[PDB]
Design a protein around this nucleic acid. Structure first.
Length: 217
RNA sequence: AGCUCGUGUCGUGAGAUGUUGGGUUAAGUCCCGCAACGAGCGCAACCCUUGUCUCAUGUUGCCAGCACGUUAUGGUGGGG
């Protein structure tokens, strides 16, 4: 993980005092996250993913920054797991019943596509239904799979997606987050300190969780 | 072209957000964003009339091609 730069962080300016525990040193104006804590935390995150998926649980993959979008998307597709990549509608978890209606519309609309209802109405209407189709499918890619609720939530760069962490906290589901040197440790249960600005560093974390769930599945 | 609601979120509370920002339109019309996701009444469309053409259509309506006309003209037989 050192090859990717899991020791990299943010500037000393943008740092958070509550991050001093796992700070190793500061070079060239950036903080170096100590990797020993990263290992002794990722093992715990691994065992937790194992014990939750093996006991009939699920985790929801959270990532929105373009550095870790395709990585999490492909990982979830290869493990068949709920995930969000494009944008998080504020209230996926709290307004679960409300956002289920969007999925029901997607399903009934795919049924309409199968039955071919594209000429029984005006051209403007069918064009608008096609626009709604692609809009709802791009906005909801890994969402057609949550029946009840996510049992755990895995996020990358919690500062960017703070609404997701706030929601998951509100409903109390555990959050597993890789926290950078600017991050907040009190909101995450299972930190895995390390860089989230690098595509490679964030990707190889998703692989680790992928392996944990895959053998846990 | 605006007025609201359900759930969510923020606030002790009155309330706020959605409905704000950039662009665009006749328009809260639409797009991109966005702690909001949707919905309703509005906007728009569906209705009438008008402008073009096709099929059907010949009376009390036309008369182009034929006949009778008396001036008084489709007036009359007939003709689409």
């Amino acid at each position: 993980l050192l090859d990717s730069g899991a020791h990299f962080g943010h500037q000393t300016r943008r740092w958070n005092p509550k991050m001093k525990r796992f700070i190793f040193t500061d070079r060239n104006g950036i903080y170096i996250i100590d990797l020993q804590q990263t290992l002794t935390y990722i093992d715990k995150a691994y065992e937790f993913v194992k014990e939750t998926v093996a006991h009939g649980g699920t985790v929801l993959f959270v990532g929105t920054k373009k550095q870790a979008q395709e990585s999490i998307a492909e990982e979830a597709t290869r493990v068949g797991m709920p995930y969000v990549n494009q944008r998080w509608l504020g209230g996926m978890l709290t307004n679960f019943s409300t956002v289920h209606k969007r999925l029901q519309r997607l399903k009934e609309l795919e049924a309409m596509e199968q039955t071919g209802g594209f000429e029984g109405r005006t051209k403007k209407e069918i064009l608008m239904l096609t626009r709604e189709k692609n809009k709802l499918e791009r906005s909801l890619g890994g969402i057609r799979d949550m029946q009840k609720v996510p049992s755990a939530v895995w996020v990358v760069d919690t500062n960017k997606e703070h609404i997701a962490v706030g929601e998951a906290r509100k409903l109390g589901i555990p959050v597993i987050a890789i926290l950078d040197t600017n991050c907040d440790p009190d909101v995450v249960d299972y930190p895995i300190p390390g860089n989230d600005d690098a595509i490679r560093s964030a990707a190889l974390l998703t692989k680790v969780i992928a392996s944990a769930v895959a053998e846990g599945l």
